[PDB]
Amino acid sequence: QFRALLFDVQGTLTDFRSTLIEHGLSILGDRVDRELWEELVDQWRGCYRDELDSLVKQEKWRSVRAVYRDSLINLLAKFSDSFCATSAEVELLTDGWERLRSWPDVPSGLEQLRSKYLVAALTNADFSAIVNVGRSAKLQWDAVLSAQLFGAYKPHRSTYEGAATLLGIAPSEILMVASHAYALEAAREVGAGTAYVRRPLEYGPTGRTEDVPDGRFDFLVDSISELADQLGCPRL
Amino acid sequence: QFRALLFDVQGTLTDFRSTLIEHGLSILGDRVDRELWEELVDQWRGCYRDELDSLVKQEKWRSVRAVYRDSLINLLAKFSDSFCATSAEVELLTDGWERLRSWPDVPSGLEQLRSKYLVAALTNADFSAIVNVGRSAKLQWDAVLSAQLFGAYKPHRSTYEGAATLLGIAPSEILMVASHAYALEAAREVGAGTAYVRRPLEYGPTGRTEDVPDGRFDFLVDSISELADQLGCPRLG
């Protein structure tokens, strides 16, 4: 009954928090302590989510690379007593979001799924960022979709339905996979299946998440390969 | 100097002619002999090219599955004295263009290129067809681009430059790979590199090949891995 699985990428398939922490400490040396940089990374992600919320209200799309770059410039001025960055380093730091590493279950989970389903990315990141993330995270897709293709971010209905028509299948034949409830709820509005992936470390050891009970979505799993088993995909 | 290679798919990476010939003979049984069906397949390809030519001159885009469907309906009326097809069979025959098998060099050639470059399809086929062709032809891409995304077919400039914008690179950082000269000449007009792959059997054993001289395009090869070697990509194990 499903033909394709569409995936959230940042956080759902990739550990962006550990990636961005190590990336920044690699670019900036002992100019910044780990505790301060991790705090910057958490506010960076928060800045990103807040700007996308405003843009969704405004019915606007804008390059997400620019969203990361501009919010980082803002944070760099706020933390300017503790450390500084040249313009070149700002570009290298922003590049960290295009170098996300994946959770360990992800590459083999996707391969297990492909025996029965098309697998495609549906990310709010720009098209070039998700292509680059495919290399850093070792993701091999049937197709790569981005908000850039549709002029709107998730949860907007044109993203899910544009994905379905591009893929030539019915929305009810799409299973949306995510670690973010808001993206599953939005796929539900257009008729797609829902699969929630719990990522307890998406926001680090002291992170908090709205809890998801069993039965709220069609599937509730702790890895992509667990999802593949519950969908009937043979192992290896 | 290049960041990404963009590929023509039908014919350049896939043997569409053998695919459609065997596919049709499987769906239609003894209703059609091989010789007649091969001639229909050849006219089917010609109608597709003629219709894309017209739409390009009109600056219009249309679904390519519908181009294939409508041309087959036209051909079925021209051959209607010899055999017929139900509407269900027309759908099944049209699906043949979404099941293309690749030339034998293509999977290991694409894998060899990825050590140094992004590789992406840039096809005039619809997005869903190129996604399906990835399975039948075992193509593994960094991204899939279609004329459907841009509202225009190659050779129009909005396809190559739209591809470059999506990939976050300059048109001059793209190497266009194709077995059709017209798609290379148009990529050159936007500043991209050109790589011609000779496919002597694209049109069958007695088919006519474009005869490309040396010096016309940046690269002239007989396989994707030969192209990968000339681009400095390390060999596969």
Numbering used by the authors:
A (entry chain A): 11 to 246
B (entry chain B): 11 to 247
Q: What did the original publication write about this model?
A:
All these three CESH[L]s exhibit high sequence identity (>60%) with L-2-haloacid dehalogenases, which are members of the haloacid dehalogenase (HAD)-like superfamily. Studies have shown that both RhCESH[L] and KlCESH[L] adopt a two-step catalytic reaction mechanism by 18O-labeling studies.
To elucidate the mechanism of inactivation caused by D193 mutation, we determined the crystal structure of RhCESH[L]-D193A and RhCESH[L]-D193N. Comparison of these structures with the wild-type RhCESH[L] structure shows that these mutations did not lead to significant changes in the overall structure (with an r.m.sd less than 0.24 Å). This explains why the mutation of D193 caused the loss of enzyme catalytic activity.
